[PDB]
Amino acid sequence: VVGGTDADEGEWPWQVSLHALGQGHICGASLISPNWLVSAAHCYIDDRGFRYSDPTQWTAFLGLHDQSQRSAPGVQERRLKRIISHPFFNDFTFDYDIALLELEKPAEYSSMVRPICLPDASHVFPAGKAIWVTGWGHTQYGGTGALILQKGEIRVINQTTCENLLPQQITPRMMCVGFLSGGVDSCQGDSGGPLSSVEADGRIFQAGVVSWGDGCAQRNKPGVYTRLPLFRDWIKENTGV
Numbered sequence: 001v002v003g004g005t006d007a008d009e010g011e012w013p014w015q016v017s018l019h020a021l022g023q024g025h026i027c028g029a030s031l032i033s034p035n036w037l038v039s040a041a042h043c044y045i046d047d048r049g050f051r052y053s054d055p056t057q058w059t060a061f062l063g064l065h066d067q068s069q070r071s072a073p074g075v076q077e078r079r080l081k082r083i084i085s086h087p088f089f090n091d092f093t094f095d096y097d098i099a100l101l102e103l104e105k106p107a108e109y110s111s112m113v114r115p116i117c118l119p120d121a122s123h124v125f126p127a128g129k130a131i132w133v134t135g136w137g138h139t140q141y142g143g144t145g146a147l148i149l150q151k152g153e154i155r156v157i158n159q160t161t162c163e164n165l166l167p168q169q170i171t172p173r174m175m176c177v178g179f180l181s182g183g184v185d186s187c188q189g190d191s192g193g194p195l196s197s198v199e200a201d202g203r204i205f206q207a208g209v210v211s212w213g214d215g216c217a218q219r220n221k222p223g224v225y226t227r228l229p230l231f232r233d234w235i236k237e238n239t240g241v
């Protein structure tokens with residue numbers, strides 16, 4: 001996260017960290033139930049040197065705050081039993097960049113581990129609404145990741161403007177969130193993480209999945225996120241959630 005600040009410990013109990021066997025933090029995820037997490041599909045694509053699509057190659061850390069303190073009290077470690085990438089995911093356009101990750105064993109709800117609420121299919125996160133992006137990703141484009149979870153406030157951008165800023169790259173499954181001036185934005189390593197939106201009664205709903213961006217925090221290049229409401233039924237059908 002670029003232009004963010006240290007989050008308070010336990011401030012985002014739904015934020016999860018996904019480590020690949022011997023590679024440390026690779027992507028973020030969100031806890032949505034005792035057994036399921038939501039993340040970005042592009043994080044689980046095999047490459048010639050490593051099988052990122054193999055659930056046994058991952059470890060999820062829930063209730064984590066500092067990457068250098070993965071054993072701290074309250075931090076839960078879990079293995080993945082399965083990775084369900086959206087069938088329509090497109091590695092080239094990044095359309096349908098969303099995945100469901102089944103925990104090998106249930107998360108234990110605590111003050112540091114708690115699911116984020118999921119929005120109904122018909123709900124719309126309005127342009128201009130303040131949203132929170134969190135993650136251990138880079139704090140600067142071409143920089144390095146954060147040890148302490150970072151948080152940043154950004155805003156939903158009008159879909160038409162989004163399409164115009166990134167021509168031939170924005171599908172209806174995507175949504176721009178951030179600022180045209182840049183400054184605050186997600187970045188490498190934040191992919192898979194959730195957008196947290198404070199709703200009418202203070203409860204937090206997931207407004208999207210960190211997916212991609214042209215650089216990080218650049219002017220006129222807000223981050224592109226996978227929308228959530230559009231996948232409510234898909235999540236329910238695949239996880240029972």
Ligand SMILES: N=C(N)NCCC1CCN(C(=O)[C@H](Cc2cccc(C(=N)N)c2)NS(=O)(=O)c2ccc3ccccc3c2)CC1
Binds near residue numbers: 047186188215221222
């Ligand atoms: N085979 C593979 N391992 N492929 C990995 C592809 C890529 C997917 C998403 N990523 C990004 O979009 C980054 C960083 C980023 C991540 C999330 C949000 C934002 C944001 N600005 N809000 C920025 N953006 S970039 O313009 O620097 C870039 C794009 C595509 C690339 C392809 C290959 C190598 C480097 C790349 C960098 C990181 C990695």
